[PDB]
Amino acid sequence: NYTEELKVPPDEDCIICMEKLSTASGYSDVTDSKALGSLAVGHLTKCSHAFHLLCLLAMYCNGNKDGSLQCPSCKT
Ligand SMILES: [Zn+2]
Ligand SMILES: [Zn+2]
Secondary structure, eight states: OOSOBOSSOOSSOOSSSOOOTTTOOSGGGSOOOSSOTTOOEEOOTTTOOOEEHHHHHHHTTTSOOSSSOOOTTTTO
């Protein structure tokens, strides 16, 4: 993960699959997950929010191109 991981999922709820941050990544079905498996909650250091890491890595191919992912919440 590239964002300060959280021993436990917050109550912000994912923003990609729009699912509870407790459950898991909704795109886990079809996603180019590298090492985010499908159960890692991390708040992007950029803004510092929270979202299914894996999920982000999905749409991350659009923005925040460097070596991590972008924040789906505030498009950070
Ligand atoms: Zn998600
Ligand atoms: Zn954000």
